[PDB]
Amino acid sequence: YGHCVTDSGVVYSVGMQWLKTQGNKQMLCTCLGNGVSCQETAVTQTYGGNSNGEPCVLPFTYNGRTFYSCTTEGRQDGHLWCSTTSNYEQDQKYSFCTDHTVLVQTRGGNSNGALCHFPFLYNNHNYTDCTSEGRRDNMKWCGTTQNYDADQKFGFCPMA
Ligand SMILES: *[C@@H]1O[C@H](CO)[C@@H](O)[C@H](O)[C@H]1NC(C)=O
């Protein structure tokens, strides 16, 4: 009951996302009991902006850097934004996104290589970063869901 097994024995509890190769690209596959909800590496839930919150069109460089996804670059409202056209500076088009659909690829603990979700609640104490609670060895970790302590599933974060 609950959770879903995939890959080669990697079961990810419901409401749990995890990156996986679906041919020749990365895909966002999350377990929800009723089945894994895979979603190609599509843009983020854009909104507002001078593009009707439509979809983005990256990679899109700005200020001198090449952004592959949404970014708060120059954003003073908090949310992020993404170019709504291959040639951003060209059509000066863009669109705001939500928490740049953050996606952490954690592994270890009790999530077995699970796409750590951020933010993540820990002991009714909301969190937003690979916290080292209970660990004394350089191995920052986070919750595989919006409520780690609520699902009892954690995972180690990347090297950086
Ligand atoms: C964590 O944040 C969410 C949304 O901000 C809120 O609904 C939830 O109650 C918070 N958790 C705690 C323990 O305050």
UniProtKB/Swiss-Prot annotation:
Domain Fibronectin type-I residue range list: 2-41
Subcellular localization(s) per the UniProt record: Secreted, Extracellular space, Extracellular matrix; Secreted
Residues modified by glycosylation: 126
Disulfide bonds: 4-31, 29-38, 56-82, 70-97, 116-142, 130-157
Post-translational modifications reported in the UniProt record: Sulfated. Forms covalent cross-links mediated by a transglutaminase, such as F13A or TGM2, between a glutamine and the epsilon-amino group of a lysine residue, forming homopolymers and heteropolymers (e.g. fibrinogen-fibronectin, collagen-fibronectin heteropolymers).
Tissue expression pattern: Expressed in the inner limiting membrane and around blood vessels in the retina (at protein level). Plasma FN (soluble dimeric form) is secreted by hepatocytes. Cellular FN (dimeric or cross-linked multimeric forms), made by fibroblasts, epithelial and other cell types, is deposited as fibrils in the extracellular matrix. Ugl-Y1, Ugl-Y2 and Ugl-Y3 are found in urine.
Domain Fibronectin type-II: 51-99, 111-159
Record function comment: Fibronectins bind cell surfaces and various compounds including collagen, fibrin, heparin, DNA, and actin. Fibronectins are involved in cell adhesion, cell motility, opsonization, wound healing, and maintenance of cell shape. Involved in osteoblast compaction through the fibronectin fibrillogenesis cell-mediated matrix assembly process, essential for osteoblast mineralization. Participates in the regulation of type I collagen deposition by osteoblasts. Acts as a ligand for the LILRB4 receptor, inhibiting FCGR1A/CD64-mediated monocyte activation. Secreted by contracting muscle, induces liver autophagy, a degradative pathway for nutrient mobilization and damage removal, and systemic insulin sensitization via hepatic ITGA5:ITGB1 integrin receptor signaling.
Associated disorder: Glomerulopathy with fibronectin deposits 2: Genetically heterogeneous autosomal dominant disorder characterized clinically by proteinuria, microscopic hematuria, and hypertension that leads to end-stage renal failure in the second to fifth decade of life. Spondylometaphyseal dysplasia, corner fracture type: An autosomal dominant form of spondylometaphyseal dysplasia, a group of short stature disorders distinguished by abnormalities in the vertebrae and the metaphyses of the tubular bones. SMDCF is characterized by flake-like, triangular, or curvilinear ossification centers at the edges of irregular metaphyses that simulate fractures. These corner fractures involve the distal tibia, the ulnar aspect of the distal radius, the proximal humerus, and the proximal femur.
Record note on quaternary structure: Mostly heterodimers or multimers of alternatively spliced variants, connected by 2 disulfide bonds near the carboxyl ends; to a lesser extent homodimers. Interacts with FBLN1, AMBP, TNR, LGALS3BP and COL13A1. Interacts with FBLN7. Interacts with COMP. Interacts (via type III repeats 9-14) with TNFAIP6 (via CUB domain); this interaction enhances fibronectin fibril assembly. TNFAIP6 may act as a bridging molecule between FN1 and THBS1. Interacts with TNR; the interaction inhibits cell adhesion and neurite outgrowth. Interacts with FST3 and MYOC. Interacts with SVEP1. (Microbial infection) Interacts with S.aureus FnbA.
Name under which the protein is recorded: Fibronectin
Organism the protein comes from: Homo sapiens (Human)
Lineage: Eukaryota, Metazoa, Chordata, Craniata, Vertebrata
Gene designation per UniProt: FN1
Full protein stretch here: 305 to 464 of 2477
